[PDB]
Each structure stands twice: as structure tokens, then as C-alpha cells.
Design an enzyme around this catalytic site. Structure first.
Site, mmCIF file in Angstrom:
data_model
loop_
_atom_site.group_PDB
_atom_site.id
_atom_site.type_symbol
_atom_site.label_atom_id
_atom_site.label_comp_id
_atom_site.label_asym_id
_atom_site.label_seq_id
_atom_site.Cartn_x
_atom_site.Cartn_y
_atom_site.Cartn_z
ATOM 1 N N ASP A 34 39.912 28.974 39.939
ATOM 2 C CA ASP A 34 38.782 28.061 39.911
ATOM 3 C C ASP A 34 37.988 28.054 41.222
ATOM 4 O O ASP A 34 38.360 27.396 42.203
ATOM 5 C CB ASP A 34 39.260 26.647 39.560
ATOM 6 C CG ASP A 34 38.103 25.683 39.281
ATOM 7 O OD1 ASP A 34 38.368 24.524 38.873
ATOM 8 O OD2 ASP A 34 36.928 26.086 39.419
ATOM 9 N N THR A 35 36.860 28.751 41.207
ATOM 10 C CA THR A 35 35.988 28.849 42.375
ATOM 11 C C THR A 35 35.255 27.539 42.666
ATOM 12 O O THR A 35 34.725 27.369 43.765
ATOM 13 C CB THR A 35 34.958 29.968 42.198
ATOM 14 O OG1 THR A 35 34.127 29.684 41.060
ATOM 15 C CG2 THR A 35 35.656 31.310 42.010
ATOM 16 N N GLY A 36 35.231 26.620 41.693
ATOM 17 C CA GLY A 36 34.651 25.292 41.883
ATOM 18 C C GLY A 36 35.575 24.270 42.520
ATOM 19 O O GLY A 36 35.150 23.153 42.798
HETATM 20 C C1 MZ5 Z 1 33.151 19.256 42.302
HETATM 21 C C2 MZ5 Z 1 32.991 20.363 41.283
HETATM 22 C C3 MZ5 Z 1 34.036 20.331 40.164
HETATM 23 C C4 MZ5 Z 1 33.721 19.274 39.096
HETATM 24 C C5 MZ5 Z 1 35.452 20.137 40.718
HETATM 25 N N1 MZ5 Z 1 36.449 20.341 39.648
HETATM 26 C C6 MZ5 Z 1 36.714 21.773 39.412
HETATM 27 C C7 MZ5 Z 1 36.125 22.172 38.061
HETATM 28 O O1 MZ5 Z 1 36.211 23.595 37.970
HETATM 29 C C8 MZ5 Z 1 36.838 21.476 36.895
HETATM 30 C C9 MZ5 Z 1 38.196 22.108 36.561
HETATM 31 C C10 MZ5 Z 1 38.897 21.381 35.437
HETATM 32 C C11 MZ5 Z 1 39.097 22.015 34.202
HETATM 33 C C12 MZ5 Z 1 39.746 21.342 33.162
HETATM 34 C C13 MZ5 Z 1 40.214 20.043 33.340
HETATM 35 C C14 MZ5 Z 1 40.002 19.424 34.573
HETATM 36 C C15 MZ5 Z 1 39.356 20.081 35.623
HETATM 37 N N2 MZ5 Z 1 36.009 21.573 35.684
HETATM 38 C C16 MZ5 Z 1 35.328 20.514 35.214
HETATM 39 O O2 MZ5 Z 1 35.327 19.435 35.773
HETATM 40 C C17 MZ5 Z 1 34.536 20.622 33.934
HETATM 41 O O3 MZ5 Z 1 34.567 21.930 33.355
HETATM 42 C C18 MZ5 Z 1 35.161 19.658 32.910
HETATM 43 C C19 MZ5 Z 1 34.391 19.658 31.585
HETATM 44 C C20 MZ5 Z 1 36.635 19.974 32.672
HETATM 45 S S1 MZ5 Z 1 37.805 19.460 39.842
HETATM 46 O O4 MZ5 Z 1 37.425 18.103 39.540
HETATM 47 O O5 MZ5 Z 1 38.793 19.964 38.940
HETATM 48 C C21 MZ5 Z 1 38.366 19.566 41.377
HETATM 49 C C22 MZ5 Z 1 39.252 20.604 41.672
HETATM 50 C C23 MZ5 Z 1 39.749 20.778 42.957
HETATM 51 C C24 MZ5 Z 1 39.383 19.933 43.988
HETATM 52 N N3 MZ5 Z 1 39.742 19.946 45.287
HETATM 53 C C25 MZ5 Z 1 39.172 18.941 45.985
HETATM 54 S S2 MZ5 Z 1 38.105 17.887 45.101
HETATM 55 C C26 MZ5 Z 1 38.499 18.871 43.752
HETATM 56 C C27 MZ5 Z 1 37.983 18.697 42.438
#
Ligand code: MZ5
EC number: 3.4.23.16
Lengths: 99, 99
Positions: free
Chosen positions: B25-27
Site C-alpha cells: 500500500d503506497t498510500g
Molecule cells: C491517508 C490516505 C489513505 C486513506 C490512508 N489509508 C491507506 C489506504 O490505502 C486504505 C487502505 C485500506 C484498505 C482496506 C481497508 C482499510 C484500509 N484504503 C482506503 O482507505 C480506501 O480504499 C477504503 C475504501 C478502504 S489507511 O487509512 O489505511 C492508512 C494506512 C497507513 C497509515 N499510516 C499512518 S496513517 C495511515 C493510514
């Protein structure tokens, strides 16, 4: 281009003549942008992330140019913490993960 | 390996004696794993995503095997529905975005 991951993969996008910064997000199925106005009909939808569910507006067939690469597809608009480019548009611009 | 994004980029990870599936997950700034009882010191932290925040436990210098690539670093453990391999570990295994 090749993008490394020591920093957030933030890129400039062009949508509706407007320039915004967005995050290339391989963990997102769908592209979700912060509150903005887009033309045309939208459908209400709900999506759930790590912190719970939000309401978004679904706009279909929206042109976005991502870092100079053209896409045309679905954009969800709502209270996302950050503009995220999800896989629906990453596939369109030919984006892959490589190691 | 090259991973296209037609499907969720799920890979097998290994943390101690536990095998799990996780998103490349690059996000994600940080690595977030579903609830598990890792040994050693940890600190409470809040992290925010779509829907708001969740409470996690931060463990430092935890070895993780990701597709047979060795990583070691900080891992956040908490009530996430999906295991997320974040940028802190993605760079250690040589992962880039390319288009
Ligand atoms: C800020 C951008 C982004 C919304 C951050 N998120 C990563 C993002 O790729 C998340 C990953 C994810 C996938 C499935 C279920 C829960 C979460 N994706 C998503 O939020 C969207 O696709 C949702 C519809 C799921 S995260 O909430 O999962 C996340 C992940 C890691 C992290 N480290 C410090 S704050 C932080 C936040």
C-alpha cells in the site's frame, strides 16, 4: 516515470481545469477526492476505511490527467483525509508496483 | 516482480510464526497489521484514514518477511480489517511505482 517511496507519492492532477495534489494509493480500490464541485449526475454511495464509513458522491466518466497521463473514469467525492488516486485510475495510466 | 493493479496487491507476509495476506500500500505511511499479540515494548498511537481514527500499538524493530524479502521496522497493530504494508517497509524490499 519511476516513483520511489521514501516520500509520499504525491502527484499533480488536472481535473476540470483545476490542479490538485493527490496520492498514488495502491491500497485503494477507488479514487476518492476531497469536497469539490463536478458537473453531471452523481449517485450517493457509502465507503468504509480504517476509521469507519463515510458518504461520498459518485461521478462517472470524469477525465483526469495524472502526472501527464490521461484517464477517464469514476471519481468519488467526499470527506477523505487526502485526495487519493485508487486502482481504478492507476490501471488506466499503466501504473504497476515493482521490486 | 511486477505487480499490476487490476486486483488488490495482496502478498504473503511472515511475522514470526504467523502467515498473513497484506496489501502493498503506497498510500500508507506506516505498516498496520490486524490484531496480534507481538512480544516486547510498544507505545499507543492514533492513526487516521477514511472514516476517522483508530487506536494502534506501535512495535519497533519487528522482522517481517514479504515475498521472501527481509524487512525490519515499525509495525502498528490494531483493529484494521486488512493488513497493510506501508512505505516504511515497502522501501526496504525495493518497491517502486512505475508508469
Ligand atoms: C491517508 C490516505 C489513505 C486513506 C490512508 N489509508 C491507506 C489506504 O490505502 C486504505 C487502505 C485500506 C484498505 C482496506 C481497508 C482499510 C484500509 N484504503 C482506503 O482507505 C480506501 O480504499 C477504503 C475504501 C478502504 S489507511 O487509512 O489505511 C492508512 C494506512 C497507513 C497509515 N499510516 C499512518 S496513517 C495511515 C493510514
Amino acid at each position: 516515470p519511476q516513483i520511489t517511496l521514501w516520500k509520499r507519492p504525491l502527484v499533480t492532477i488536472r481535473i476540470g481545469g483545476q490542479l490538485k495534489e493527490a496520492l498514488l494509493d495502491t491500497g485503494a480500490d477507488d479514487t476518492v477526492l476531497e469536497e469539490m464541485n463536478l458537473p453531471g449526475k452523481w449517485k450517493p454511495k457509502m465507503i468504509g476505511g480504517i476509521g469507519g464509513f463515510i458518504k461520498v458522491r459518485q461521478y462517472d466518466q470524469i477525465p483526469i490527467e495524472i502526472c501527464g497521463h490521461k484517464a477517464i473514469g469514476t471519481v468519488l467525492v467526499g470527506p477523505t483525509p487526502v485526495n487519493i488516486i485508487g486502482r481504478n485510475l492507476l490501471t488506466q495510466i499503466g501504473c504497476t508496483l515493482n521490486f
